Design a protein around this ligand. Sequence first.
Ligand SMILES: [Ca+2]
Length: 238
Amino acid sequence: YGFAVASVLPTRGQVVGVAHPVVVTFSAPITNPANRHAAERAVEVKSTPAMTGKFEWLDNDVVQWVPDRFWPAHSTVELSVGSLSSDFKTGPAVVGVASISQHTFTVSIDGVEEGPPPPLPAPHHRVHFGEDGVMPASMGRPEYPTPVGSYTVLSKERSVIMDSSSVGIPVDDPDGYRLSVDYAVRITSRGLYVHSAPWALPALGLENVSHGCISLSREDAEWYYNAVDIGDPVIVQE
Ligand SMILES: [Ca+2]
């Protein structure tokens, strides 16, 4: 019973975003990497509709299966993991695409680009594109760039403290920082977020000045935060 499965995410009947992985937690650590292939076969993921994917070990006792494609939105996905039968539900496909070169974050809901209504007085004025769902954004500066890739929303939190130690700079170090971030959508375990950055307004849509994170206005961040679910995909591209 070395490959005994304690639990699986999504839980039965959970509502998740359209790229949510299948996360398998084992009752005991599998410390021998050579045994992980046999463990992967024991927890073979069989979904309806059929889906290909790849296993990634998060800990000695946690392997996640990352689907190669998005689940269908607004659906019930049947899931078998090593004879354990389950199911879960998907909400809308809320997809965010960050473009480093455009300085934009484009949100679509079930394929239709959409964003919040515009404010009559945002400040003196500010960049806004007039194309649905295209939000002006600021990615990482060249010293701390936003890495290109395909991500999923790992968590959503309010008023979270973000500290400069996440990118290798002490709080009291000269170029360090300690911020309270109003809306925070975490997309990597190491601490990459889509978030509200009101101090960074003049750069949005124009310049990449963050330390890796995808910076939005408070209003754009609030709307995206309220729309997105854990498991929804975020794509970062050049
Ligand atoms: Ca959810």
